[PDB]
Amino acid sequence: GSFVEMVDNLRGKSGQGYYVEMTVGSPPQTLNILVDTGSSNFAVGAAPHPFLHRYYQRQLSSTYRDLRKGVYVPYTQGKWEGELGTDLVSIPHGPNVTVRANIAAITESDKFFINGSNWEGILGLAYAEIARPDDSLEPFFDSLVKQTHVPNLFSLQLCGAVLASVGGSMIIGGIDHSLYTGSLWYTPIRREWYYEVIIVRVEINGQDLKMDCKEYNYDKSIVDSGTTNLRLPKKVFEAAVKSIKAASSTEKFPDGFWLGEQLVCWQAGTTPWNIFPVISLYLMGEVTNQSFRITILPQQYLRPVEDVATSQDDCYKFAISQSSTGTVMGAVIMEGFYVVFDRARKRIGFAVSACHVHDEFRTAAVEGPFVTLDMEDCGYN
């Protein structure tokens, strides 16, 4: 309940993700590693790509073992290619342990590493089913639990805000009660591949979208620290934006803004947060016919873009976007909440984050219980 050593072990920059310090090999080589609940490989830069502050030098490690197998990982945007091996891995500001983990030594990549970012690898925290090349490549967290007495859970407090610094905590093997207020509320992990969950109802400023709830999870809903946006299925996005436009009628904005094709800027600290509605996702609860509600503010979904050279004003991107891969509860969701990935009990806990950004009128919220019928029908098959 109190893991003081792990508090504040996350760093980052706006729009560049949250990383944790790790060591690989003997003697230990220090690397900054993106915390990613939306993938399942531990994959680290292993060659001098010019964007990289540093990289894993396998020749320097006496504990390195080669698996004599490569892996090619294409994405929608980018790609990486790597060579598989195992080595000793530890987390300096995490549990006092050392595990032998699979490592994909990245040897070629495209549109993967971020120019100007301070991380050199990715820690895939999701399950073996989506590991590359196949489910026999045991993910890091699985090895950690198998090889040690670290309990089968972790929790994330992602704290949003020159690119401004972000931070937070990754509590490995436990929960730190100072990181949230009120109660944790749990939603079932529907299936252990991604951190899959079921959205049961959507509200904009308390106004139900009245869609068939299956649309909310077409073809899945996931919790993903490695995605910035709240990503919504195309039809859900359309209805949500229509409703958000209606709720913020006080001012007009161009169509491009809602599509993330264009920024909107306001003069120095004069953001009309109050014209923008709250957004509420109801998640499947732990018991039959019971749900709970998570609520985020414009402070979560209207994200500052700091690196605009051509403007002297305060510029923002609408960080709700359309998706072909289902709902993605990215940083836009997770920055509102302390999120507990309770792998042992196949569930995910949400609580109001003690570090979430809000104003004097409105706060992010986690509330329940509510009575919701036919919640199983909301899952897609």
Q: Which residues are catalytic?
A: 36, 224
15 touching ligand 0B5, by CB under 6 A: yes
CB of 332 to ligand 0B5, least distance (A): 8
Q: Of 8, 11, 16, 163, which one interacts with ligand 0B5 (CB under 6 A)? A: 16
Do the beta carbons of residue 230 and residue 319 sit within 8 Å? yes
As given in the structure block, the two tokens for residue 103 are 């490592």
Do the beta carbons of residue 236 and residue 325 sit within 8 Å? no
Pairing of strands 314-318, 264-266: antiparallel
Distance, CA of 69 to CA of 80 (rounded, Å): 15
CB of 45 to ligand 0B5, least distance (A): 12
Closest to ligand 0B5 by CB, 17 or 85: 17
As given in the structure block, the two tokens for residue 277 are 């509605």
Closest to ligand 0B5 by CB, 76 or 136: 76
CB of 66 to ligand 0B5, least distance (A): 23
CB of 367 to ligand 0B5, least distance (A): 25
75 touching ligand 0B5, by CB under 6 A: yes
Closest to ligand 0B5 by CB, 15 or 298: 15
Return the bridge partners of 109, or none. 80
Do the beta carbons of residue 41 and residue 129 sit within 8 Å? no
Q: Of 122, 296, 339, 364, which one interacts with ligand 0B5 (CB under 6 A)? A: 122
Query: ∠366-367-368 over CA atoms, to 5°?
Result: 140
Query: ∠360-183-299 over CA atoms, to 5°?
Result: 35
Q: Of 6, 9, 10, 17, which one interacts with ligand 0B5 (CB under 6 A)? A: 17
**Binding marks (x or -) toward ligand 0B5, 221..240, rule CB under 6 A?**
---x-xxx------------
CB of 214 to ligand 0B5, least distance (A): 23
With 0-12 / 13-18 / 19 or more C-beta atoms within 10 angstroms meaning exposed / middle / buried, residue 374 is exposed
- Placement of tokens 């073809």 in the chain: 219
Q: Which residues touch 222 (CB under 8 Å, ≥6 apart)?
A: 38, 194, 195, 196, 197, 326, 327, 328, 329
331 touching ligand 0B5, by CB under 6 A: yes
Question: What is the three-class DSSP state of 76?
Answer: coil
Distance, CA of 316 to CA of 271 (rounded, Å): 10
40 touching ligand 0B5, by CB under 6 A: no
86 touching ligand 0B5, by CB under 6 A: no
Question: What is the three-class DSSP state of 79?
Answer: strand
- Region binding ligand 0B5 by CB under 6 A among candidate stretches 34-42, 180-188, 247-255, 267-275: 34-42
36 touching ligand 0B5, by CB under 6 A: yes
Positions in 151-190 near ligand 0B5 (CB under 6 A): none
- Region binding ligand 0B5 by CB under 6 A among candidate stretches 70-78, 81-89, 233-241, 364-372: 70-78
Residues near ligand 0B5, by CB under 6 A: 12, 15-17, 34, 36, 38-39, 75-76, 78, 112, 114, 122, 224, 226-228, 331
